[PDB]
Amino acid sequence: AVVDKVFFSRLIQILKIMVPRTFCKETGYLVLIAVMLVSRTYCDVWMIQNGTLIESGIIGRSRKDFKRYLLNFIAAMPLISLVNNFLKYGLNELKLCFRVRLTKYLYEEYLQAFTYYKMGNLDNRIANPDQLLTQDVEKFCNSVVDLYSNLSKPFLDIVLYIFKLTSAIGAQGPASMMAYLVVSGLFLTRLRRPIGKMTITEQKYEGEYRYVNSRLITNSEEIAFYNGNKREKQTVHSVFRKLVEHLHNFILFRFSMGFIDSIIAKYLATVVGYLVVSRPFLDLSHPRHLKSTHSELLEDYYQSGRMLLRMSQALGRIVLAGREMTRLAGFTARITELMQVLKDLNHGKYERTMIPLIPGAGEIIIADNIIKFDHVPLATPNGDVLIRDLNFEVRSGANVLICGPNGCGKSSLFRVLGELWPLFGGRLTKPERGKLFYVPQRPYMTLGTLRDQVIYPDGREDQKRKGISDLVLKEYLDNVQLGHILEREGGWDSVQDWMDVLSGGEKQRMAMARLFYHKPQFAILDECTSAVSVDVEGYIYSHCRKVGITLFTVSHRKSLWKHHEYYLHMDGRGNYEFKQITEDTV
Amino acid sequence: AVVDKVFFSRLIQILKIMVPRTFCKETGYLVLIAVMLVSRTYCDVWMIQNGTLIESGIIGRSRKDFKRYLLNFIAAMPLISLVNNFLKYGLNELKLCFRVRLTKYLYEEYLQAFTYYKMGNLDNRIANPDQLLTQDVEKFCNSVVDLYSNLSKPFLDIVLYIFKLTSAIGAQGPASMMAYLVVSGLFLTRLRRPIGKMTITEQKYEGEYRYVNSRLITNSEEIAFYNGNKREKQTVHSVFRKLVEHLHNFILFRFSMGFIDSIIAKYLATVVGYLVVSRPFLDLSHPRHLKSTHSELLEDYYQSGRMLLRMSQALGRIVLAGREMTRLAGFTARITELMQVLKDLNHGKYERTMIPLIPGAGEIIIADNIIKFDHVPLATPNGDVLIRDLNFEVRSGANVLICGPNGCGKSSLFRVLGELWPLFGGRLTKPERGKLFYVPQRPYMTLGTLRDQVIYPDGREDQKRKGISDLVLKEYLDNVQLGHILEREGGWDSVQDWMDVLSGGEKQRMAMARLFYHKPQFAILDECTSAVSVDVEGYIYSHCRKVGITLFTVSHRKSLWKHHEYYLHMDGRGNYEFKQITEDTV
């Protein structure tokens, strides 16, 4: 988080995404804000001018002037509220418009061709992508708009008040006040250097105190078996004393530093301000400004004095806004990292995953109802080769059974099957990403109606395009014997958190009902049909055979060996067996 | 977190712990703070009185009066800084003294007779005890002192300024201003009711947006196998629109509410203030106050006007302090819950652990070198009986081997052995908590020197009491062949995080070196000697036999069966076997 030319360039790009045109609504809010910033400055100076006239009326014991200027203030009261609150409304809307624009751009780039998947399970340059896509966008939009507003308001205030004081007091007044404020700020900043060192030391000691307590907790049983209460007490007490003595020293230093700070920045500023403003008055022979009535002297003094105070407050605010620029730089850096990674992924380039050409080798061809592995060395994307050259085919209507110990390498095969990981040479055949399925032990369950659950990848209008009437959907439910669920929550339209409402067996049955509804070419059964009866398994397998859906199974059960022709076996050290059938066993 | 009489009573007790005497240092800081609060109020009113005299000197074009009162301000400048910063220093010290007193009391009650162990592994009324013992104490002390200061400063300011205005303007002025401020506050609070409802709705929608994104992350592989990019995009976009439309409505309402707030509380307050202060002036026949010079009229007006402003600011601050009282109540409730549980544990009473008399049944006798289970039905403290009546003895010099599948019930036996869990009937014999040992797979390793590691439950002065010279300690290291570690980090005094510096085998060897150094009566070997050679195991077992230390083993290895007389076997359903020896196997 350091401000350079790269920082500004990166802001320019991000803002270009956030301001696409010149006649959008963001430009409308920007001009609205600029107009209200100028109006707000004028309203503030008018209040300064009118307040002294009300007070001169009161002091002069004149009811005419008091009432005249009080009514001027009352009649102008609503306009000031509009000018201030319309500014706030414009700023809030600009933040919200910025958020919507950035989120649309990020998510359009994000939900495209496994990029959401690759971001976490194929790269490591960003963790917790959801946090960065949601929280950082809001924070960045808020920070950029807050910086704009907080640098645009003080700037105008300082310009106007310096211009007016150049005439009321002369160029010497504002210059001397600003010179003192700058010098005092530098001097106090130099004096306040140690606070940072003491602050980090305090945080370190508090961290040590927390860590020691946590250790005493996690190892409470072993300590309890010992009679070590009189020892852990000594250790924690010693750590507490270490922290406490530092706190004394930090408090004493803060007291000493505060004393000088109050004297220099709080009261000598008042003395300098009195000296600066008093020049036109105490100079009885001042050229032209002040040879006037008492009321004129009263008004001129208090107008000038209040202008100096508000000018100095503006200097403080602009300093604060400059400090907030650092946070803006931090948010921009994170967002720029995100945008870079999306650009890398969307073009296939990836780096730092969690040797042949890692970023894709060989070729992939497109065909239907045919899968052909031809010298494809499936491997982890890190480059670690899982196995030697592998070759096998599943031509049509053929079932393959995966057997062996805990695989840890078959997942790689399944991921390359659905383009999830790059190819590593040879030539391979696949359909167009829509003909492959994979149901884990607990299939994916969405939030919404049961019709959404069974029509997951498609919308209702998509179903109408296919013409699948709800009766056929019920038949698919009937085949898996899930038709009774329709009455559980009052029809299809019922919306519930289906992730936990259904039991395991129900989830797998609906998942295969979804498989039935889709009628794809290939599917993977990653040992999911574990909470269902044998009869239903054979019943669904019979449908799969009759329909023509090729199926991959990982059951390993003897009956499933009888129901499958091919088989794959791995020893955990690198090997694979592929043949027609086994007479009795491997 | 609701204020009642119980809340105040609980504060009284906690503060009684925090203020033990009447002549301590806390009472010194309290009187110091009270004196500085009064001085700070007087200094503020003096500045109000002197500022108008400086300004009347400037306006009067009188260098004599300007210089006179400016020098009065300069000469009194250091005293005001002392009065303000000595108040801040006193408040900080009172917070720190409060923290030290409370922490000492809590930890004295906490580290006593397994109470640290029971708090987390025998009850459930508090989780994360370290967080409550460390963070809540600091926050509570800060909150109580902040409430005291922020209710004591505005109170004095309001009293002084109302008293002075009762004479400057009359009782009508302060009364009318306070009446308007109260009425406006009530009216605006009534108008601002919906903001809370909209705020919670906004937080709910943001939570939904975060949850949906997280779901898209955790289920990215299954979605990827599908071509569902065009569906999760629709779901997330719909959720974003739901949030965004609410944000529009919330922004528009905030704009509308702000407009009324500015008009009523920001400017009509100024109009009412002008009307209130102007009464003595515009009344040309005012009885006595104002029949005076222009400078007197100038000074009287601005003194009164500034007093009204600071009185009203004090009303705002006291309102804020009252709001902070709610947080104080929350912290007190948590601390009172902690104190109650420590009191329950320290007397043996416990509730809600994670049927016979759960809180202790039977009796425990004290003896050395003898352990006698007599009809003790060991069970979980929840009351669920693990096994039926159990009886066996380990008289002297006898070794017992535990065998079977994953136990899950032997841990209960070991915990009752070291008084960690209550007895459930019968009569049992144990030594005085100092003769039992238990080394897990990874023994406990402290932060400190190696001498601390081997002398864990004892201090260096304790070792000098026993007279164990460092040569004998080295011999204990030599027996376990850990003498070479002395040169690894430059002698005993080297301090390092021994939790991870040592490898497993080294940790167990030092743990048994600690066992050797202590020479207790009974010890438990929870399958820890797994990363050590067979020769060293026999070598250490020979020492244990020769020394006379009875030993319990959980190895299950055949050679260890040969080296152990008794044995315990559990089937996981409730049973135990205890006999002299086994000819070949169970």
Ligand SMILES: CC(C)CCC[C@@H](C)CCC[C@@H](C)CCC[C@H](C)CC(=O)SCCNC(=O)CCNC(=O)[C@@H](O)C(C)(C)COP(=O)(O)OP(=O)(O)OC[C@H]1O[C@@H](n2cnc3c(N)ncnc32)[C@H](O)[C@@H]1OP(=O)(O)O
């Ligand atoms: C219009 C044209 C023709 C020309 C002008 C055009 C402009 C645009 C050109 C110039 C623009 C400049 C101004 C920009 C500034 C920003 C820059 C870039 C960045 C920085 O910044 S530089 C970087 C490194 N440098 C630092 O980093 C330390 C500097 N740091 C600070 O500048 C602040 O951080 C502090 C905290 C020090 C100042 O802020 P602050 O302390 O709050 O101001 P303060 O002095 O308290 O108020 C004023 C006081 O006038 C007194 N007073 C007068 N009259 C009366 C009266 N009649 N009655 C009672 N009192 C009176 C009274 O004492 C009142 O104060 P009081 O009544 O409240 O006690």
Ligand SMILES: CC(C)CCC[C@@H](C)CCC[C@@H](C)CCC[C@H](C)CC(=O)SCCNC(=O)CCNC(=O)[C@@H](O)C(C)(C)COP(=O)(O)OP(=O)(O)OC[C@H]1O[C@@H](n2cnc3c(N)ncnc32)[C@H](O)[C@@H]1OP(=O)(O)O
């Ligand atoms: C000494 C003895 C003899 C007798 C007195 C003894 C005392 C101790 C007895 C009385 C103590 C009472 C006072 C205690 C109070 C606390 C109570 C218990 C709790 C509450 O509280 S009740 C609970 C339910 N009730 C609410 O919950 C809504 C109530 N909520 C509020 O009370 C605040 O929350 C707000 C925000 C509304 C008020 O605070 P605030 O708005 O900040 O005050 P504000 O009106 O702005 O300042 C004053 C304005 O005088 C104007 N002004 C005058 N003269 C001039 C001039 N020459 N030039 C320019 N302007 C002038 C100017 O307009 C200035 O203001 P400005 O120049 O800045 O615009």
